[PDB]
Ligand binder design. Structure first.
Ligand SMILES: CCCCCCCCCCCCCCCCCC(=O)OC[C@H](COP(=O)([O-])OCC(O)COP(=O)([O-])OC[C@@H](COC(=O)CCCCCCCCCCCCCCCCC)OC(=O)CCCCCCCCCCCCCCCCC)OC(=O)CCCCCCCCCCCCCCCCC
Ligand SMILES: CCCCCCCC/C=C\CCCCCCCC(=O)OC[C@H](COP(=O)(O)OCCN)OC(=O)CCCCCCC/C=C\CCCCCCCC
Ligand code: HEC
Ligand code: HEM
Ligand code: HEM
Ligand SMILES: Cc1cc(C)c2nc(SCc3c(C)cccc3-n3nnn(C)c3=O)sc2c1
Ligand SMILES: Cc1cc(C)c2nc(SCc3c(C)cccc3-n3nnn(C)c3=O)sc2c1
Lengths: 79, 378, 62, 239, 64
């Protein structure tokens, strides 16, 4: 029901484009690419990283109170 | 005559895959729908090979699986494709559901509700197949489910002595486990066709949440080449597991044959059932355990009416994104706890994380979206 | 404006689209000639004196 | 039931991503199977046919199946008769039924060895540390009438006498048959017995990794060619 | 024979004499009172862990 000549109504916008054979394959790869992924990462990590830092501190405490109870008892084996 | 537009079969292919209008800013999180369809076809063809040499009898079930890995030609590669292809299915399925939850795709109501049905049917299928080899996890996995399935108040004990053939454990026992496991993947296929028929009425969502009818591109060639590339990158990772570490995800205890006499040192399911197992063992009851296991998949169907934000996706909502990855880091906690023994530190951590899974979805998320509406003045 | 050697095959065969879909068949040849020189020979070189056909000359002396 | 001792990691020569099994250490490990065990342990899934091209030729394999005669089935003008090995025979079992096996071995049943490294949490690191880890009981523990102290076994008390010591057998290679040499060879054999596809597995994994190294960077360049139309587009708005 | 060589040379390390110290410090203390449930199967494990970690790094050179 929704094909290309029936989607919206749009006025006064213009598009310019080049052929794929008139373009070189890598305009930039490492001079554009490295600073763009360094700011996409700065925007991410203070939303994503702090929940996984709290799982790490629970894993480290939980696998340290199991070993102190599975018979590491020198002074907890008194008459 | 354009024959792509006038032939009765070629019209359907052209409207569904070639001339389909698609958003231009679709990410690679939208790759995992066709990856799920590749993983389903792979499990069907490989499973139809194993079913010509398997024997469903509790005296010769374990011995017919060792025979195909040693005697039948290319039986060892096809068996470990099947076991590792099922882990591949469940990792793509959890990415797929988490995508639709973060971007707000559950607003396609008929597409979301067929999806929650498909999630139950693949979880029940994978349970039946892990009973069929009959080692010491197929035994102590089957009995833990079916004494938990005798705690249904009025028809419970009627249903437990139906699936074993009527007896306790015998030859005719795994004919019913095998016949369910044969049939359910072909119903999953029919439900996935209806799934895409309802999505064809609106087209796709996009990472901004905003409608994109002024910026469509055709599906061919832009997403036919992007989906082929993601499928090749998935067949690479699967074969790294089959050919360089085929026993990494399994357990060694399933290479001992089932014995009601001997004793297994621990009870550990597959990694993708370990989160549900941790919610079970936190409820000291056997009716309230099977209820809270079924309510952890069925809470997905309340996501359309719990939505109180003015915007559709989480791209522009920074407080809802801290709660989304608190929920992912809580399903990692429940996977670790489900593979630990039941002693003191892992018993309070396990039940304080079963509470947090329901407190985030039902209470903390709808209140946080209202605070965000008020800081933007709607 | 001396260009680089891109257009070896743009004009003759890969223009009529014939050899574009034929290179899966016509172009199926001589790379299982060329990659025994790889994988097989790298395999017996990492494992030297450890395989059967290395050591089988001892009991094969009839 | 307090804490376990977990086996250390040894540098086996098949612990690489492309490293094969040593096929002379398999050959010396079958002979420690067939002179030291084979008497308390079974190996139900391996036949004499499985050793042709691995550590023996076909002759040297018929002539080893000859060495024990077997109990064939019924025929007319006779009985269930007897006959030497046919090279299609599995390795001959060592206890009439499961019940004789208990009384011959202090109530404990000795396990089948066809899947033993695959069915242990630690593999051949566990089997090596078991056979060379027998020691004396510490002061405080007592044991039963026939029951021995082994610290790397679930609950130190094993119902198994130490089965290998110095010069238990003689290898037909001139290799000195000390205690550590013979334990190293029944870990290599019994890794082959569990995983007989080990070497074929790692050689298909290299013929996949370099015929994907042709196919992947060239579907990626086809993708980047189509999408450059959209990545270079410019937009203007003129109301 | 190569094992008894290696196992003795690595038994004089700052972790394995430090474990032998507490071991016979407690070995002497169990046998006195004859109604006691105290073992030292613990104490043996701290020594065998420290020792067997160093045997594995050195033993496979001397074999085959
Ligand atoms: C807000 C939350 C979302 C709101 C939900 C509404 C939309 C979702 C939906 O379709 O629900 C499916 C349906 C619920 O809707 P319903 O039962 O049809 O409602 C009754 C309507 O009054 C009956 O009216 P109707 O319009 O549904 O009648 C037409 C009906 C009849 O048409 C047909 O079913 C076609 C016949 C198919 C069978 C073909 C022969 C057998 C092969 O069509 C369907 O039922 C299509 C849905 C079935 C999909 C699977 C088709 C099987 C293949 O499925 C469920 O029971 C569970 C999933 C949805 C539960 C969410 C509701 C909260 C609890
Ligand atoms: C049970 C076992 C579960 C297995 C899965 C575990 C996976 C771990 C997830 C780790 C990967 C982290 C993704 C990195 C991307 C990231 O953080 O960048 C943020 C980036 C910003 O993108 P936009 O919102 O478009 O921009 C907004 C402007 N701020 O956000 C994203 O990429 C969001 C991605 C959406 C999620 C898609 C996949 C979901 C991930 C995890 C699935 C786990 C399942 C969760 C519930 C499913 C239940 C079956
Ligand atoms: C004459 C008796 C006897 C011989 C010979 C013997 N064993 Fe054992 N072994 C046993 C008994 C009995 C058990 C069961 C132990 C138990 O349950 O305590 C056992 C168990 C084992 C186990 C399993 C331990 C576990 O965790 O289940 C391994 C591995 C093993 N033996 C290795 C060997 C190897 C390798 C050889 C010879 C090359 C060997 N054994 C020879 C008596 C023997
Ligand atoms: C075997 C199972 C499934 C298959 C084969 C499958 C297949 C697909 C495919 C091919 C798409 C279109 C492409 C894409 O966006 O990735 C899609 C979209 C979608 N699926 Fe699934 N799916 C399955 C399970 C599920 C589940 C379990 C859910 C949710 C509970 C779900 C919900 C959705 C939604 C909401 C969309 C539209 C998303 C959007 O456009 O933003 N599906 N599915
Ligand atoms: C969504 C599809 C499927 C999933 C997730 C799935 C999952 C599984 C799993 C996890 C096992 C246990 C294997 C092991 O760990 O050893 C198994 C076994 C088995 N499956 Fe499947 N399966 C699927 C489809 C099928 C189909 C369609 C068939 C048959 C037509 C099939 C036939 C078998 C057989 C015969 C076995 C027993 C042999 C063996 O254990 O290897 N499977 N399946
Ligand atoms: C390689 C390959 C081939 C095929 C044939 C293929 N087919 C699909 S399903 C197309 C679809 C339908 C039918 C209906 C509604 C929406 C979408 N759709 N829209 N966007 N995306 C990402 C979608 O999948 S993926 C895929 C990948
Ligand atoms: C919807 C649904 C249905 C079922 C039936 C279900 N069952 C589980 S846990 C089963 C289990 C146990 C308790 C112990 C050992 C092994 C296995 N087990 N069985 N199959 N697989 C792949 C396993 O890991 S969650 C779940 C969710």
């Amino acid at each position: 029901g929704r094909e290309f000549g029936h989607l919206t109504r749009m006025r006064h916008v213009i598009t310019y484009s080049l052929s794929p054979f008139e373009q070189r394959a890598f305009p930039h790869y490492f001079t554009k690419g490295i600073p763009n992924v360094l700011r996409r990462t700065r925007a991410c990590i203070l939303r994503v990283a702090p929940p996984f830092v709290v799982f790490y501190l629970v894993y480290t405490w939980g696998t340290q109170e199991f070993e102190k109870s599975k018979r590491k008892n020198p002074a907890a084996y008194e008459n | 005559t354009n024959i792509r537009k006038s032939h009765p079969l070629m019209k359907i292919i052209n409207n569904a895959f070639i001339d389909l209008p698609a958003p231009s800013n679709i990410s690679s999180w939208w790759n995992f729908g066709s990856l799920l369809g590749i993983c389903l076809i792979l499990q069907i063809l490989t499973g139809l090979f194993l079913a010509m040499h398997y024997t469903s009898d509790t005296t010769t079930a374990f011995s017919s699986v060792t025979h195909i890995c040693r005697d039948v030609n290319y039986g060892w590669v096809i068996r470990y494709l099947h076991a590792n292809g099922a882990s591949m299915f469940f990792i793509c399925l959890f990415i797929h559901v988490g995508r639709g939850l973060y971007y707000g795709s559950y607003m396609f109501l008929e597409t979301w509700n067929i999806g929650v049905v498909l999630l139950f049917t693949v979880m029940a299928t994978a349970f039946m197949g892990y009973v069929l080899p009959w080692g010491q996890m197929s035994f102590w996995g089957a009995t833990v489910i079916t004494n938990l399935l005798s705690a249904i108040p009025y028809i419970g004990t009627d249903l437990v002595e139906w699936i074993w053939g009527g007896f306790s454990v015998d030859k005719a026992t795994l004919t019913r486990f095998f016949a369910f496991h044969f049939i359910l993947p072909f119903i999953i296929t029919a439900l996935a066709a209806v799934h895409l028929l309802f999505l064809h009425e609106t087209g796709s969502n996009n990472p901004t949440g905003i409608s994109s009818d002024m910026d469509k591109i055709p599906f061919h060639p832009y997403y036919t080449i992007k989906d082929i590339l993601g499928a090749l990158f998935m067949m690479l990772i699967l074969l790294i597991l089959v050919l360089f570490s085929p026993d990494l995800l399994g357990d060694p205890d399933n290479y001992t044959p089932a014995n009601p006499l001997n004793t297994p040192p621990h009870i550990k399911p597959e990694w993708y059932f370990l989160f549900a197992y941790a919610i079970l063992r936190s409820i000291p009851n056997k009716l309230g355990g099977v209820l809270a296991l079924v309510a952890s998949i069925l809470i997905l169907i309340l996501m359309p009416m719990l939505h109180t934000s003015k915007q559709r996706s989480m791209m522009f909502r920074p407080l809802s994104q801290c709660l989304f990855w608190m929920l992912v880091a809580d399903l990692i906690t429940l996977t670790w706890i489900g593979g630990q023994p039941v002693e003191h530190p892992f018993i309070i951590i396990g039940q304080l994380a079963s509470i947090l899974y329901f407190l985030i979805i039902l209470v903390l998320m709808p209140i946080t979206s209202i605070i965000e509406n008020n800081l933007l003045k709607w | 404006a001396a260009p680089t050697l891109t257009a070896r095959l743009y004009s003759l065969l890969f223009r009529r689209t014939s050899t574009f879909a034929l290179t899966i068949a016509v172009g199926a040849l001589f790379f299982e000639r060329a990659f025994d020189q790889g994988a097989d020979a790298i395999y017996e070189h990492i494992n030297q004196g450890k395989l059967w056909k290395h050591i089988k000359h001892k009991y094969e002396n009839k | 039931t307090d804490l376990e001792l977990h086996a250390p990691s040894y540098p086996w020569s098949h612990r690489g991503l492309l490293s094969s099994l040593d096929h002379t250490s398999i050959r010396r490990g079958f002979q420690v199977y067939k002179q030291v065990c084979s008497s308390c342990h079974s190996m139900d899934y391996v036949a004499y046919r499985h050793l042709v091209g691995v550590c023996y030729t076909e002759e040297e394999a018929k002539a080893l199946a000859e060495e024990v005669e077997v109990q064939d089935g019924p025929n007319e003008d006779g009985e269930m008769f007897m006959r030497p090995g046919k090279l299609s025979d599995y390795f001959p079992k060592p206890y009439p039924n499961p019940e004789a096996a208990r009384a011959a071995n202090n109530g404990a049943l000795p396990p089948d060895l066809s899947y033993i490294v695959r069915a242990r949490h630690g593999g051949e690191d566990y089997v090596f540390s078991l056979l060379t880890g027998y020691c004396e009981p510490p002061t405080g523990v007592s044991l039963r009438e026939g029951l021995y102290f082994n610290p790397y076994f679930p609950g130190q008390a094993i119902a198994m006498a130490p089965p290998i010591y110095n010069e238990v057998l003689e290898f037909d290679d001139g290799t000195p048959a000390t205690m550590s040499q013979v334990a190293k060879d029944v870990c290599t054999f019994l890794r082959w017995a569990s995983e007989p596809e080990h070497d074929h597995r790692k050689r298909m994994g290299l013929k996949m990794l370099m015929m994907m190294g042709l196919l992947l960077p060239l579907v990626y360049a086809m993708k980047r060619h189509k999408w450059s139309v959209l990545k270079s587009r410019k937009l203007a708005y003129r109301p | 024979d190569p094992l008894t060589t290696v196992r003795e040379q690595c038994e004089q390390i700052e972790k394995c004499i430090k474990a032998r110290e507490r071991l016979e410090l407690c070995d002497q203390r169990v046998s006195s009172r004859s109604q006691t449930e105290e073992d030292c199967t613990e104490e043996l494990f701290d020594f065998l862990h420290a020792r067997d970690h160093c045997v594995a790094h050195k033993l496979f050179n001397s074999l085959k």
